[model samples]
Target chain A: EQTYFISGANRGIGFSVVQRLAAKSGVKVIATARDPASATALNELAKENPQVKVVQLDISDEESIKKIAKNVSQYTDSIDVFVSNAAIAKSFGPLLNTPREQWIEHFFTNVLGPIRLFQELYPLIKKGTQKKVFFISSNAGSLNLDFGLDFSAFGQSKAALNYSTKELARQLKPENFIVAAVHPGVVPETKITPEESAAALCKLFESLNTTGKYLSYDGTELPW
Target chain B: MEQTYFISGANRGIGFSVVQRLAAKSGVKVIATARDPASATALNELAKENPQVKVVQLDISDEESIKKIAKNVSQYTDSIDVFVSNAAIAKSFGPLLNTPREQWIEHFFTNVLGPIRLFQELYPLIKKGTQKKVFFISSNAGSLNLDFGLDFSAFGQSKAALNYSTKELARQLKPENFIVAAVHPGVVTKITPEESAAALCKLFESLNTTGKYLSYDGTELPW
Candidate 1:
């Protein structure tokens, strides 16, 4: 039996990650939502799998993270897979006009959120069968994208996340563990109907761990 | 006109190369900072041999230490013309699962945050100085647009952040006429460190532009 811990599971790509995994018999998911009371879709999705558990989590909150760690520790000593698909796209504008407060907030959620997850929950994941951490990243982090200049904060935050993934990947090499920054999706983007791309990313976990590589869901290598 | 510059992590590699170049040709003073000046024999000897090169202790990862150095530098020069942040560690292994979180944090602390905060702390001094230009020694590995997914994770990601930081610094300091940019060192491969340093010096002189990332090939660099 495999256990997958996914943040931002209430909707979009994260929801689909829970969906495809829950459909399987031997898999359990620690699906997360910032406010589970209002996450009807995630709650409903978890119902389909008696093993899938839903929890309250907000990546931006430090206290919420500590609570989740204690709660998650009670479930399994070792986690099989962990993915951070949660990120807030904020302060989308030119660099000169971008507010300083928005930039800090963006870093809090997009950069520090995943970092907080690793800081609190790594012990359990270290004991897992897969021992891999994946950060869901985007092309915006790529400095080469200059077709239209905007969302400087989002791009910078994602860029920092990408950097952290690389550093983590490099450090973990001796232990035979893997870390990666992936542009994961089943469709033209994560925008496709859930059923279409869920299987694509699900199957992607098999051979894509080349270590420190930026990969697309289909196993294609992305630059930087 | 004699110019003064501050360089961090200047005991080895590109930073060291830059130091020796300044001693030989630039005819300007260089304030080279290291974690321990006593251990950096070459740096210390350079100080002993030349009146221009001065050695100081600095660890960019520490915040308090930075402020202390800022206080110390004020006694040495009125302002700094150029600041080059070149201290960074590299990773050559593979399989992301094998690496640890500690390694990533260490790299980020040294490579990204090191320069980010240093540039921030030095802003006032650099602003008070004449040249108002800074260069972050970055690499091509930081560019996400190019294809090739394996190896150099720690170095690449840190450089990517450096590029991002450079862009933002350019924006904030634009009114003051600060020419900040990430300068990639791998573009032009010269034979020796001296040659590399001289060519880089040539490039440094030609940079009257601002806000754009550049390669050693004297062309623009990517994010």
Candidate 2:
């Protein structure tokens, strides 16, 4: 059986990705959310599918990440793929108006959270046959496409995440790892539904051969 | 009759060298800040030589310290023509897995938030000054596209955020004719602190453009 791990799988693109993956007969889907108790949709899917397991994870919390990694270790021998889909984009406004607290929150949740999660799950990833990692990043994080919008807190965090993904791709290339960041194209805002984005994302995760790339949900390259 | 210059982390290194260069010019007012003012012997000695030089204590990581320094700065000069945020800390040069939680938090606090907070406090004085130029000492380590896979995760992450803010600030202040930019001071050992400072100062003085990332040699850099 191929085991897949997904974070922020309670709803949106994350939930849709878990739905798509769990439909396969031999796939074991382990999903996580900050509050698994309240993740009604994911829990319902877990009830329906014996192969799908929902776990608790608040990526911003260091201890939470450690506990979840250990917990997941008890259930599975290895994780074939990890989707770093959980992130926050709450703050908006001019750069000067953004509070220090807001910057801290975004960076904690969006950037460092994924880095720490990857660190915690590294062993399981190494043991798997198909080691693939994808960060659900945005064009908002692209420094080249910075349209002088007021979302510095969110954008800055994404830019840092992009850098981390790029660096991680470089470090793990020798070991035959496929690591990348994909911008879920203007999701919910655009005509595309969460399920559509997740469909494209899962397909790209299965077929992508290149390493250290930033791509759109449609598999097009994005400017860094 | 003179231009006023302000820089952080002026106790030693490039910061100290910049202060020394500015102090040599007789009419300039140099307001230098160090985390520990008492131990900044070279800076203190230079202040002694140049009456226009003012040494103040500033630890950008702390909000109270930044506010206190702003008050102290107001006592010395009503306006500051140029402010160079040069203070930054690199907690570790290791992989992200090996880095502790504290390293990431500290780097963001000192490298990104602290400098932006300092600017917020000093905005009034900067508004009053003639040059109205704000330069943050950044590094190529922050460059996303041209990165050579350096393991400076926390430090580089902070710098990339810093660079993003530089452009955002430039856009916000452009209507006011404020020139805000980030400069990547070249890697060390190739040039001494004195040479880098001199080159940096020259580039800072000659800038007419805003929102541009530049090298010490005055070439534009990629985002």
Best of the candidates, DockQ: 2
TM-score of chain B of 1: 0.92
- C-alpha lDDT (0 to 100) for residue A186 of candidate 2: 66
lDDT of 2 by residue, A1-224 (tens): 78999999999999999999888789998899899889988999999996888888998888898787787887799998988899988887677688878888998899889988888899999999999988899887888885546567888888888877887888889899999999987661356888899899988988888898999998999898
Q: How does residue B3 of candidate 1 score in lDDT?
A: 84
Model 2 earns a TM-score of: 0.96
- For B1-87, candidate 1 gives per-residue lDDT tens digits of 778888888787677888888888555888898887889988888889987888878887776776677777776777889888877
Candidate 2 segments whose C-alpha is farther than 4 A from its true place = A188-191
Interface RMSD of each: 4.9, 1.2
**What is candidate 2's DockQ?**
0.70
Minimum summed lDDT over a 10-residue window in model 2 chain B is located at: B90-99
Alpha carbon lDDT at B156, candidate 1: 64
